[PDB]
Amino acid sequence: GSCKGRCFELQEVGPPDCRCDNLCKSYSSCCHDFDELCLKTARGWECTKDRCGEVRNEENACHCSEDCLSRGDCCTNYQVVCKGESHWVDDDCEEIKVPECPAGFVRPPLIIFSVDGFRASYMKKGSKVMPNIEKLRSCGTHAPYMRPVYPTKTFPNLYTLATGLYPESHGIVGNSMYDPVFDASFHLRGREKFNHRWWGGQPLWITATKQGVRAGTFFWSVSIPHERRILTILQWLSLPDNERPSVYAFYSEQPDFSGHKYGPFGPEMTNPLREIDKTVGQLMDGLKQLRLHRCVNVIFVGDHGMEDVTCDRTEFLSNYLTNVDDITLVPGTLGRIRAKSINNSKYDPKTIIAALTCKKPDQHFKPYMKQHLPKRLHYANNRRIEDIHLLVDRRWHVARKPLDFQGDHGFDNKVNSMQTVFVGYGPTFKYRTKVPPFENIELYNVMCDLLGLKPAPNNGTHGSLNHLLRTNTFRPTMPDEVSRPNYPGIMYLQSEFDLGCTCDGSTKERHLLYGRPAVLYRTSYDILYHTDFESGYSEIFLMPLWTSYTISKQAEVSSIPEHLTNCVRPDVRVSPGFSQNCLAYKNDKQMSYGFLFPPYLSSSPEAKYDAFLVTNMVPMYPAFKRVWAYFQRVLVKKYASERNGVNVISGPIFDYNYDGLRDTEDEIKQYVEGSSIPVPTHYYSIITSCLDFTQPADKCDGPLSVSSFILPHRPDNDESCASSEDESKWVEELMKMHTARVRDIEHLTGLDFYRKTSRSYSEILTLKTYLHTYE
Ligand SMILES: *[C@@H]1O[C@H](CO)[C@@H](O[C@@H]2O[C@H](CO)[C@@H](O[C@@H]3O[C@H](CO[C@H]4O[C@H](CO[C@H]5O[C@H](CO)[C@@H](O)[C@H](O)[C@@H]5O)[C@@H](O)[C@H](O[C@H]5O[C@H](CO)[C@@H](O)[C@H](O)[C@@H]5O[C@H]5O[C@H](CO)[C@@H](O)[C@H](O)[C@@H]5O)[C@@H]4O)[C@@H](O)[C@H](O[C@H]4O[C@H](CO)[C@@H](O)[C@H](O)[C@@H]4O)[C@@H]3O)[C@H](O)[C@H]2NC(C)=O)[C@H](O)[C@H]1NC(C)=O
Ligand SMILES: C[C@H](CCCN1CCN(C(=O)OCc2cc(Cl)cc(Cl)c2)CC1)[C@H]1CC[C@H]2[C@@H]3[C@@H](O)C[C@@H]4C[C@H](O)CC[C@]4(C)[C@H]3CC[C@]12C
Ligand SMILES: [Ca+2]
Ligand code: NA
Ligand SMILES: [Zn+2]
Ligand SMILES: [Zn+2]
């Protein structure tokens, strides 16, 4: 019945007994005197001159009595006003070469300071508006921005930070969602979100606790003001060695709420940012008070940005569909479409897609079946992600009908207005260090490193942010190759082939600039040398897993001759048994074919003939061949010209169950008619060159520059609303939208790239996680 001496205790009591923890308010189970004892407001949160060395009054919110320092319960400015200290902000950067902690502290603590709706460009306002944050940023380790996860909403991004996982893995696929096995819905407001069943993965505080590291309470009831959360953390830090937590979290609802009201560029934003900064300076002055301002790792992190969005920029689905009362839409900065009543019978997804596709000239959203969303969003492998999805343009809303704020967010995570912040400050972080942008999915690993914890399996690439840290507890180890390649010679005669096909050296060292890709699964496959390209031919999938080649700045683009239009040549080094045949392509009226190494970039007429081998051949829809041919004939040259040559590794992907991971044979669901030639769901390419663009690709001393994509292999170009125009109007726009990381392709292909470089392996991991966005 009473909280005396138990205020903000670090545990759950029960089973009937009343609570006094930071969550009891959300659970309607605080003792009767929680409010009176544990949430004192009397006399504000700041000592004043005439309060110094005072009568200790126990009704005060924080104290200025001489004993206060003993008890960890002074106000954060006590020593500034009374004992003549300066604010932490008014001190110089001083490098923290080691953690200066008091005796007993077995590790540097971590405090995560999470700000909601914090746009990366808010940092331009600087010390004029935010002195404390501008100090953390400048003195510590900072990125120009940090990419959130899609959808760029709060709960998916906050729980991605906590777990290292994509929203499709951790289960919090939106702020609002429906689960068809639970037959229940999750919303920001409601009791359903308290069920543990909605939250998967392993958040940081569980990884801490399971490995005997004490986790400071990680959620805050909204009735608890910010100055109090900050005093409670400081008080938890003053506890004995055997009771003290080593990891803490603070969360601010700003500047998101203000961001919605007035937009991200409104002059009103200044007061919310000043407020957050003063909160930060209470934390830093409190830490300095406890002599932990050079002991503690502080992470200043945001969940997403904020965009200009007004209600006059809305699209209504009732201008496109007729029976809008037969569906439920999740509206706003994304769309998710489902039947209203599951007992509909004639509810057809196919019809809905058709009706929403390329209707208006100014159309500000695009429909997708979820498996056809760009793979970089990794937003499909969850039963809570509705099959029909709407990618909404920046600055726009989507609603169901017209009878259903100047700022919003939720759009595609590459959009510049959705980018958010990262600062790391403290001993373990580096000093006055800029680092390149990175994805919030990586941080879980860093936070485990900072706490000496073994991360749970996650979507970060462990080691990929070692360059943020003064001291790494983790050195990445390159994985072991599983299947060694065959190098089969000439083993069959040309008359031994009837596949129904008609027609009429320093190869390793100039076509695999960065070593041979390692195959990390059990399979049989052949390496095949040619003058112009090298490939890893799969005998199970009857096509290359990868195909690698290099083009100089000065190299020639030629056409395909007319007499070799339908030329496909049988490959003597591979048995007919493990070869594709040209008959199935005849029998298959929808499927045609393309080539991985382009015949358009043959070094000579003689060399060109290797491009028409059966072992360079891949199943391709005529629709897709328009995309692929324009890439090969024009863009591969274009990129070679601009980047002083380029290396290119192209290949197929199979992902029919849309889990972002390499399909096994069992999981392949489409073959070329009357055959066992499997149809790729996507085609990838990894295009590398020298970052120092003065040096050419095959002679690069310095760092490496990469771009990649994963083009979806579709029988139409309905995704591209300008597809009926000439390829130069739409293909490169299609490709850029499906830009990808090297890492995404490795998940999808079970291969490992960049094994033979002169660069450190942690630097390669950064290169593999890098995403070209075109902003
Ligand atoms: C991103 O990283 C993650 C993590 O590395 C990758 O996802 C992981 O993918 C694995 C391979 O597909 C899955 O393995 C399968 O697990 C089945 C059992 O599932 C339950 O246990 C899981 C294990 O959990 C451990 O790890 C977490 C780490 O956070 C800890 O918290 C735990 O303590 C455990 O140590 C658990 O993850 C599963 O959780 C899923 O389901 C529950 C609901 O039941 C949800 O609450 C979760 O959000 C989560 O849902 C996701 O994952 C499932 C698939 O499991 C999808 O269906 C959902 O759509 C959603 O995405 C479960 O509680 C195994 O039985 C299964 O075995 C198969 O394969 C073996 C051989 O290997 C065969 O023998 C079997 O016959 C069988 O077919 C398989 O091992 C992991 O579950 C999954 N983990 C997570 C956290 O998502 C992901 O691919 C990465 N993404 C990319 C792009 O690389
Ligand atoms: C969603 C519920 C609270 C909603 C309001 N909160 C406002 C303050 N807030 C916050 O403090 O954020 C800190 C933070 C920072 C980062 Cl970087 C990352 C994260 Cl994830 C958070 C942000 C929001 C909360 C209240 C109670 C929560 C449940 C727990 O009582 C019990 C469980 C504990 C498990 O570890 C996870 C699952 C579960 C059910 C908790 C889920 C979230 C609940 C319901
Ligand atoms: Ca798969
Ligand atoms: Na055909
Ligand atoms: Zn948010
Ligand atoms: Zn918001």
UniProtKB/Swiss-Prot annotation:
GO terms for biological process: cell chemotaxis; cellular response to cadmium ion; cellular response to estradiol stimulus; estrous cycle; immune response; negative regulation of cell-matrix adhesion; phosphatidylcholine catabolic process; phospholipid catabolic process. Its cofactor is Zn(2+); Ca(2+). 1-tetradecanoyl-sn-glycerol 3-phosphate binds at T154, N175, D256, H409. Zn(2+) 1 binds at D116, T154, D303, H304. Changing T154S: 15% of wild-type lysophospholipase D activity. Zn(2+) 2 binds at D256, H260, H409. This is Autotaxin. The gene is Enpp2.
